[PDB]
């Protein structure tokens, strides 16, 4: 359990680091830096949703904020995990609890272990709704400690 | 509603492969709901805040944030 | 985070001595202590609702904090100050019970005064709030650890002040 | 100490501290004199330990003492019976602690790493720990020689 | 993150011309040093944990620093260094390899100072240990790659102090 | 160097010398600028090479540092240094001349008949020159440190 | 390998291979002769490399094979030798692949584990494959010696 | 995931044998087609979206699937359908460049049967389009390319069937 | 998860009843176990690794399956072996010390078989190794202590068969 | 359950057009291969109980599942093994003669993953027996005949796995 | 044993047994459940036992089995793994009848006189039995470990 944060090596998926922080003011034409944060951006694009969401879709507003450098890497995942896409494509299509579980198998990177798991985080989603689902996830001390 | 902050947060026990200036010198913008628990998180993991102050809409708004 | 045992271990590491006498003199201190520590932290834990709601009835409630006009006024600032004071009450009985102050140091008063200054918290009325809270734990639970829940009260409002 | 890592726990958790773990600060707080005695005993002849433990590791490991090794010369000796003292001053702080986390802030994260870089091999280090280890509860009582030995153990369990 | 070759093309750019001679004579500097600097990035490379401990052997192990009372006391604080050490050597060496300094100030002396001025490191003590290094490494891979990591070393200290 | 030896080989044949010894002289005259940079990185770290070769062979071999032995005291290791010093100068010698021919005639001639004289073990001097050899092509690269494992390799197949 | 690397690299990225990538696996590609030529030097002379380098490993580390050791006695010592045989095999695989990943992930992740449940010092495991890794640079070319004790220094460093 | 190095020693190590000349002459046949796998390649991701437009220009257009009622009726559904055909063309040109097929069932045909068969998406339609895109692939990069191509494509047809 | 304490009480108050002479007697039984228990949990806290060491050089060493083609061939599948045995002796501890096997078949042998199946783990070289660590462990601590220790052995040697 | 034939007409039916020039040439292929289809099923339908412990005798024999405590360990256990083993040769035999896998995932592969992993059948076992019985009737039946029959092989491995 | 000192203190006295003594008896009666629980702890694991303090004595005292010691050789170390298991088998009678008596009247009374026959250095076996001492009361519980060291500490006081 202290080897939570520890990423593997060639029998795993690879890891995404927002490392250099984007920092230019009076920028190069070919500075290196945005290419890298398109990257990164583009890996969360596809890890929260899966796919590559299609044109019309995507969140520019949060993708802005991130190649400014005021909000994280996890305040844009959360970003990206409470839209309307997000929602309508997977909270709203399905049942609660499978909608509970795709969740968490997206966000945390791993699937629920047992009962009082999963009847702390419907609870999360009885008494105040989705929203709060994704801001239990996102606070949760494994997720901290993952990523 | 949102708090400009920034703040220095040191590794608690490890050492580290990655550079992570950007770990260590936080400069965000936290959302006023949020804000207590990442107050909360800063606090838990032992770093220190330099700065709190709301850039957004003004202390007082009882209607509209 | 640190307790008076690993302060004085933290003392006795800087400057590089092992464990002295006085030391054991300040650690057999702390445990005399502790045993009633543990008796008041019990008692606080017990009606922490009940102080929290009593020190609110003594101070704040009929001001014009909790009326209109005052910064205590709608129903989500004043679930935002029963927090406020649930948190000084919760992190005051650490501090009773590692008898040291740097957890206060560490957690409550890092960035509390420029977020206090920020969203326009009067400092005035949450010390009065902490003073009323302060004699209510120290009816509630005793006179000697009313004293060790007052010395750090009381570091909780010189911070904050 | 426990205090501490009780508070850790309970705060990660986000909840108050379980009647169990008061009855461990309880206990803790009433074997206050039993560990007293012990980091007195060990901070009374810390002397005799450290000399009788550093020939025993120079008998045992002769490598550390030969020309081309770490420790030759005086003043290198000296230095790795001050690291013998360091250790044994860590191992007091703990027993005072009834926890071994002072012994893990001060000397036991990067261990491994600056004995790369000074060249000491650390399972040397690992055996002194260990000689210092069999001559202290070779002096105390065996219920405090085995509380002793807890930390010790611990020390050199993180050592190798 | 620019090479010479980048800031070349970089600075053709910003004015809006094609390539004129002069930038290929820019170019041609460029490579004919960076047949050795790719002889003098694989000795480094090679002898990177001889370098740092000689460094720290140097300057920083009998001093107050390595000592009780320095920043550099603990076995955490002494990894930390230790570490430190090891990314100024890395970064130096990529900006040897790049023939520009960009990415030490990108990457290096970025946010570096004000952790150092807020976690209370000397500055000082870490401009020698990056000097003593600066010339354990000019000592080992040779005198013009020694000079071409001497300005990078100083254009660390530079964006330190 | 190669052009000395090539005179006296075209000497004792009694003719000029064979085109294929003149492109060998061209060839050698062109890699002068690798030869260069051998010996430029050996004169560069020689004090680091000899310190951790001396601890290496001390460490290998012990009996020329224990009582009774040859290197015994601190002037005795350190001549043993100074001896260290000067077949590493021959190597950077014999590198930059591109013949093994100055390290045969300044230091290889009468080498047993004179470690005869002052007692010292032979083969502990070619463990020596092999723990420099060691050292000094771990820090070159591979290509110059065959170059320069060559002119070491000579040296201790003239040692044993 | 390169090609699975380069494979993963790009597919988390939800890209192709870049050309820079392209040219990566085109000179691994080109220099997959060089690479057969050193596995034949290291396959063919197997029985050597072994047989050479446990006898420098024993005679370097004398204690794993003293009673008391790990490896004391006839059978514990051929396990010690077939240990040796399968990192050399490890050592050819990687040298094959272009890369350490056949090296790592076959035997190289929970190493400390197991010879921690064997009872083994990994250290000397270390000074083994470093007599093998001398042995078997000693017994090739310049270059080819480089790029075999690329992998042979990649286990030590994985050892420690 | 593995390609044709990494069977080859993973077979060569299960066996626990070296590498003997059945190894060698595999490696030999994967060194000497490599060349054109990494031409082929380049020349696939040339025209990524001109094979897979061919593809639905050759098979889907202009059918009942495209008409209301089929199963790629909506914009929603054409978009998701190239993606899909996208992504049947990447995976085939990454298991030619590998030159091993495993890639295809751990991360294409591991659930895609049954994903296929939830949604409602017809099979034999999408296998007519994978079988048309490698057709306009083999007419692109040659014969024998067109071949070590569509022996995965054949792949990926024969595990969805 | 639950213990002798918890299972009575359970089954009491499923009942609604009150406590009997029968879960008195059964308490009893428990509570003149527990020091027995606690004296055979320390033990075997004692020597985790020992008996685990113990156990693969009396069953899986120098067989097959250490051998090549062996599930247990490979560092990480040896890294693995020794973690899940140590598993099996650290979860027969929690059982014998709470008295009751729920925690067993809660959290070892939950999904076991089948993550074992679809691993290809033998099932049958694992039970043989469990069975020669409770002989190692019941060689330890004694005759009645290593029973109560191998009743838990034999629950989860037959929950994984 | 439908031939190719049967699934051509479905397919030209669903359409409700003719058949046309594409069905024509997939019924010729169909027409051209049926003979060796024929040869082949008499062929297996010769050995099919030496097919059957042949592939025994190389994947499941003296290995740990035979042993006690594997899954086919009783005579009840290893008679409903070779029942199943003789199931999918037969099966697979009949999806060689229709040219179509529907039989397949009709009758074979429809409850059989949750049957195996109600009783606790090792699937990668049963997977290493079906692609050793596929090796075997590959050796009997020659080349091209052995990779027809090897295609409905994969098949009920994939759908098993 | 207990019962056969008590019976012989008070049958040269010519009386009964007194009742202090037979008390003792009884209390002896009642901790026999406990020594039994010690000799079955002592019993199952005398493999490692044996094996763990050879080898941490030849580890300490590598002279006797270094060429010109006595357990030097193949049949030598076993002989000495079989005084050592000798040694440990009487630790287990002591412990089962509570007193010294079966460990001193076995093996205990010519000790010296056979080991100055057999040319064995006595110290070096003090050495052996700290060394079972320290396995086997690092293999139990606290009060346990103290009632076995008792009769391990009876051996090796009366070994010098
Ligand atoms: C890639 C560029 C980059 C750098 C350089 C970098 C440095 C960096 N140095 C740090 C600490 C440190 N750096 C030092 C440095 C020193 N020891 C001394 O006393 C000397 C003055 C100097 C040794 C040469 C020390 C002692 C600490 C830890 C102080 C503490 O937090 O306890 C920390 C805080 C987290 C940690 O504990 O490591 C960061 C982020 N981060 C980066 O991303
Ligand atoms: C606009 C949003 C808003 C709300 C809801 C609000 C509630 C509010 N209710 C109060 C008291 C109170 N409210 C009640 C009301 C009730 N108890 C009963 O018996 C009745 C059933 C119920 C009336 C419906 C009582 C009895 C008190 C005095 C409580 C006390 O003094 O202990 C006070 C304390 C006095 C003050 O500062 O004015 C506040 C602030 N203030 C706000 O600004
Ligand atoms: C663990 C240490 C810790 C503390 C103490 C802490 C306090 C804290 N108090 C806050 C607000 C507040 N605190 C008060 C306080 C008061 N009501 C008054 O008028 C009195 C003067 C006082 C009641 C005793 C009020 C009214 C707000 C909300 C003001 C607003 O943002 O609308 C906020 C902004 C987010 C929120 O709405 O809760 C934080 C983060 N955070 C921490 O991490
Ligand atoms: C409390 C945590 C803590 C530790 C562990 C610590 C270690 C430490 N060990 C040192 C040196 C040393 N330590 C050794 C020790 C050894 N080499 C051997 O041969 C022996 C086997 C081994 C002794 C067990 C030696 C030889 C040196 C000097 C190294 C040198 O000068 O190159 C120094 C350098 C001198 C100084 O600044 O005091 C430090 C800081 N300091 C700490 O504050
Ligand atoms: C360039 C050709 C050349 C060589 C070879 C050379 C050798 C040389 N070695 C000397 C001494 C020595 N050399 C050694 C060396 C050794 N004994 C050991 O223990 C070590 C194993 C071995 C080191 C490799 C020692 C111990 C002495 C001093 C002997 C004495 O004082 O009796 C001296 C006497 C002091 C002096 O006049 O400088 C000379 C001349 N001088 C030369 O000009
Ligand atoms: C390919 C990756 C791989 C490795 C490395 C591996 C090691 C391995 N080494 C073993 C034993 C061993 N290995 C050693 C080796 C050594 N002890 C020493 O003192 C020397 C330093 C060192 C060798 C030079 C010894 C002594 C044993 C026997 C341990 C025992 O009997 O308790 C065993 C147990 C018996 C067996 O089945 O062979 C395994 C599985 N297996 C693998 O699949
Ligand atoms: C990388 C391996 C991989 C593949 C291949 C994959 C396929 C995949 N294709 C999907 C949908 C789809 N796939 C198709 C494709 C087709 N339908 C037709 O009529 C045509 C015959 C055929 C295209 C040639 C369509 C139309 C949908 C959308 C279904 C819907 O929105 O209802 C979905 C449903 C979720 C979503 O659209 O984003 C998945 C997961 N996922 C994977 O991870
Ligand atoms: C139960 C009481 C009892 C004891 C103790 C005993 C000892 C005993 N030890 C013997 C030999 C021996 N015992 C040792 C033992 C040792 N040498 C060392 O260096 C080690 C320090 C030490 C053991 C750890 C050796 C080496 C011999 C062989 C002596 C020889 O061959 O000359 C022999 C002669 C051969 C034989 O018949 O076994 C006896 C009788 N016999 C007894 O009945």
Not at chain 1, 74 to 90: G, H, P, Q, W
Request: charged share 25%.
């Amino acid at each position: 359990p202290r080897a939570r944060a520890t990423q593997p090596g060639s029998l795993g998926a690879k890891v995404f680091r927002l490392n250099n922080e984007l920092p230019s003011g009076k920028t190069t034409n070919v500075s290196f830096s945005e290419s890298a944060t398109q990257k990164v951006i583009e890996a969360a694009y596809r890890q929260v949703f899966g796919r590559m969401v299609y044109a019309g879709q995507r969140q520019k507003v949060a993708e802005i904020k991130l190649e400014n450098g005021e909000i994280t890497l996890r305040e844009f995942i959360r970003a990206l995990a409470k839209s309307d896409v997000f929602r309508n494509t997977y909270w709203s299509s399905l049942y609660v609890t499978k909608a509970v579980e795709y969740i968490h198998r997206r966000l945390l990177g791993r699937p629920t272990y047992g009962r009082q798991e999963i009847n702390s985080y419907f609870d999360t989603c009885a008494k105040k709704g989705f929203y709060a689902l994704v801001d239990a996830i996102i606070d949760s001390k494994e997720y901290e400690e993952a990523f | 509603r949102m708090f400009k902050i920034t703040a220095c947060v040191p590794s608690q026990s490890r050492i580290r492969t990655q550079r992570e200036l950007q770990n260590t010198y936080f400069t965000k913008l936290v959302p006023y709901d949020n804000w207590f628990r990442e107050q909360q998180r800063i606090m838990k993991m032992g770093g220190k805040i330099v700065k709190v102050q709301l850039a957004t809409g003004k202390p007082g708004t009882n209607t509209g944030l | 985070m640190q307790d008076a045992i690993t302060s004085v271990i933290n003392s006795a590491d800087v400057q590089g001595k092992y464990l002295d006498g006085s030391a054991m003199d300040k650690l057999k201190a702390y445990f005399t202590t502790g045993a009633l520590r543990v008796r008041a932290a019990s008692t606080i834990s017990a009606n922490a609702a009940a102080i929290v709601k009593e020190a609110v009835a003594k101070s704040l409630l009929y001001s014009d904090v909790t009326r209109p006009g005052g910064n205590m006024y709608t129903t989500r600032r004043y679930a935002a100050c029963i927090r406020d004071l649930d948190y000084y009450l919760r992190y005051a009985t650490y501090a009773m019970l590692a008898g040291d102050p740097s957890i206060l140091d560490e957690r409550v008063l890092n960035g509390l005064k420029e977020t206090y200054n920020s969203l326009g918290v009067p400092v005035g009325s949450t010390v009065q709030a902490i003073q009323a809270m302060k004699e209510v734990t120290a009816g509630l639970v005793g006179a000697d650890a009313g004293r060790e829940m007052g010395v750090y009260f009381d570091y909780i409002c010189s911070g904050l002040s | 100490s426990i205090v501490t890592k009780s508070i850790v726990n309970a705060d990660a958790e986000a909840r108050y501290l379980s009647p169990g773990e008061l009855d461990r600060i309880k206990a803790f707080v009433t074997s206050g004199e039993s560990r007293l005695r012990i980091a007195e005993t060990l901070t009374g002849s810390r002397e005799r330990i450290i000399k009788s433990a550093g020939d025993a590791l120079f008998q045992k490991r002769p490598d550390v003492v030969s020309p081309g090794g770490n420790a030759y010369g005086e003043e290198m000796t000296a230095t790795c019976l001050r690291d013998m003292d360091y250790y044994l001053r860590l191992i007091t702080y703990g027993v005072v602690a009834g926890d071994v986390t002072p012994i893990e802030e001060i000397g036991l994260v990067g261990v491994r790493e600056m004995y790369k870089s000074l060249g000491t091999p650390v399972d040397a280090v690992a055996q002194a720990v260990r000689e210092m280890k069999a001559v202290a509860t070779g002096m105390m009582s065996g219920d405090d020689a085995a509380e002793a030995g807890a930390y010790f153990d611990y020390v050199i369990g993180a050592m190798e």
